[model samples]
Target: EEDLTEVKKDALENLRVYLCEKIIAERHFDHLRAKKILSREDTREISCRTSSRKRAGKLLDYLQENPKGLDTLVESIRREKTQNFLIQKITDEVLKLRNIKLEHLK
Candidate 1:
């Protein structure tokens, strides 16, 4: 599976992108495949435990349906994490760079 032919590789590339976008939040496709609610189309790409996407997909909906979920997303925005330890240390040492802060002007 790792060594794909050039044509198969090209075909799968598009499928990978399409699959990755479904559940959102940039998690692995395998995770989404197992977890997300699927639709008529979902059966082709995503693997479901029992059934799947007419139902609300994880991290994709609920926020849109209920008001409080949006509130939580708004709260999470100000909290930040980075890929590198050095970058995190630098950001911590400095006066809060790379993420939003709701501080008022002095």
Candidate 2:
């Protein structure tokens, strides 16, 4: 019981820090720039924006033009050591925040 309590406390503390970092770093707001570019005042107006549709179409066209772009993005996630390290760091931190412990029983 005591161990579980300690784990809960640690998880809460980590979550607090995580939320603070997200806010101060404005990582969550990064998507707001794209949202503004795709702006619709309401749901009814969303699909009617010409600029937004054009931008989306252009992105689709680029991806379709170069099949390698998808592979490159995937390879970047897998083979890039620095990116893997950063991703693992975030993953570990998030797992810690949830008090999750992976145990290999052998």
Candidate 3:
């Protein structure tokens, strides 16, 4: 029983780390894509793309300045039902797993 408990705890911790890393990676990719779009000077190409580029740059800047900013941005995105649905889905999954583990102890 003790071994099982320890394994579960380690698993939970690993899950949290994996989820957080995944979110960061996705956000970084989005940031890179946005940067690429914005770096192009031709604004007439696509208005939506231009807007997304600007937004992505802003988010990237925030992430660069504040280490914990990604967490807040992910949380906000998760709440808003935005373009980052995949990140939110993973976040929700991690939270659900965490909750299940916590509840089991009670």
Candidate 4:
């Protein structure tokens, strides 16, 4: 549970900056929905936005309510060859957070 919360926070921190800016909303949303990580209503709400950026931003907002969903998201993104960089960055954040927790285990 703690790890889920930690990774969820890490995902938001690591992805928020670039996700909205760089992600192709339709593509990412498709994968998320396919994985059942995002629901139809969630898809509708996000897709209603005017700009792609806003759509992706709304996705982040909705994802905040889900913890393990973040895992599926990372999985979804990596399924696309172009998004490999994102997974790498997210993994680095998780590793960094893991190290911090370990060092504090004094």
Candidate 5:
């Protein structure tokens, strides 16, 4: 298994609200799989959710466990012309997590 950092976890966690509201998981499932970011099982679990928000939540929950999840999700967005506008905002938020210091050594 790939090691996941709290910093990266927070990057996704902090944006859950925006992501669940804005992302259409059904729309990106295929592309995510195409990139190998999502597996067949992943889509199956995600699609089980009845609501759009719920489906998106399921997808994000899965991504949290995946090490390459955020990057591949970003890549999937880049491939979608209509969704290109979403990238910058998401990237900005993710990068913000990078600036946060986990430990302050004095």
Candidate 6:
């Protein structure tokens, strides 16, 4: 029970950070970036702050629409990131990822 409580606490904390990034970061507002990413054929560049903010914004917005759906939303994000990592494995580069950025904050 304690561990679950801690997990929820930590998740909320992460959500807090996401809210912070959604406003202050420059890249967060670039709505077209995702389309660009999906359509790209060659080497690509992305701003993580923008990506994080953009993604967080979408998730938070969804959570607002479905107040009881927090866990579902979080799980979707976790799956999304894991899928991205698997996709990343197919490539040989990364300007950065969440775990990596955790070690070297910008």
Best TM-score among the predictions, by candidate number: 5
lDDT values, one for every candidate: 0.32, 0.33, 0.41, 0.63, 0.64, 0.35
Each model's total of backbone clashes: 4, 0, 0, 0, 0, 2
Candidate 5 wrong stretches, greater than 4 Å: 1-6, 102-106
Evaluate residue 19 in candidate 4 and report its C-alpha lDDT on the 0 to 100 scale.
66
- Per-residue C-alpha lDDT of model 6 across residues 18-75, encoded as one tens digit per residue: 4334221133534333333232421122233344544345434434434334434333
For lDDT, candidate 2 versus 6, the one ahead is 6
Candidates in descending TM-score order: 5, 4, 3, 6, 1, 2
Per-candidate TM vs. native?
0.23, 0.21, 0.29, 0.68, 0.69, 0.28
Question: Candidate 4's C-alpha lDDT?
Answer: 0.63
C-alpha lDDT (0 to 100) for residue 96 of candidate 5: 63
Q: Write the per-residue lDDT of candidate 1 for residues 1-106, one digit (tens) a residue.
A: 2122222323322323333333223333443344333454533332332233422243434333443342232223233233344323322423332122222212
Q: C-alpha displacement of 103 in model 5, angstroms? A: 5.6
Tens digits of per-residue lDDT for model 2, 1-106: 3333333333433433333222211223232223333224422232233543332233222333243432222233343333365445434554554444332111
Model 4: per-residue Cα lDDT at residue 83: 46
Range of the 10 consecutive residues with the lowest summed lDDT in candidate 5: 97-106
Among all windows of 10 consecutive residues in model 4, the one with the lowest summed lDDT is 1-10
- What are the root-mean-square deviations of the candidates from the true structure over C-alphas? 16.6, 14.6, 12.2, 3.9, 4.6, 13.6
Candidate 2 least-lDDT 10 residues: 20-29
Name the candidate that leads on lDDT: 5
Off by over 4 Å in 3: 1-51, 82-84, 88-106
